[PDB]
């Protein structure tokens, strides 16, 4: 939950970042830990909520 909140705050202060770049950075450049979650949606209006 802390990771999700931190990512939300970080993305809030960013001028429309590319969602695919964020997806690649999260998938490749981060360790996969035990408790996992995912967000899959085709429009950049539901990802924030």
């Amino acid at each position: 939950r802390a990771q999700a909140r931190r990512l939300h705050t970080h993305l809030a202060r960013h001028p429309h970042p590319d969602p695919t770049d964020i997806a690649h950075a999260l998938a490749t450049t981060r360790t996969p830990h035990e408790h996992r979650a995912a967000l899959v949606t085709d429009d950049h209006g539901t990802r924030g909520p």
């Binding site: 950075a25 490749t28 450049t29 981060r30 360790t31």
Partner: protein, 97 residues
Amino acid sequence: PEGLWELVDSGTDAIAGFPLDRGWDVEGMYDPDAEAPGKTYVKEAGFLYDAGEFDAGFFGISPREAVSMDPQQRLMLEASWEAFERAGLDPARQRGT
């Protein structure tokens, strides 16, 4: 690094009072004169008040080991993990490198 940039750019002074949770007798170790054992004339200095804070469970360190662990080692572990994460490198995948 962004926090450091915010601090220096705003011209904020980080000097503050001594820590009180470290067992220091801060009330009884201040006198004005410059020559006395066990006493100092400085009220304030930079400090990490969360120096003892450490995520022991993340690195597989038990609480009893962490209590008997130098704060320098804990801070260096956390800072190294953060630095590797900020470099675009997965710290777990650096194993054996």
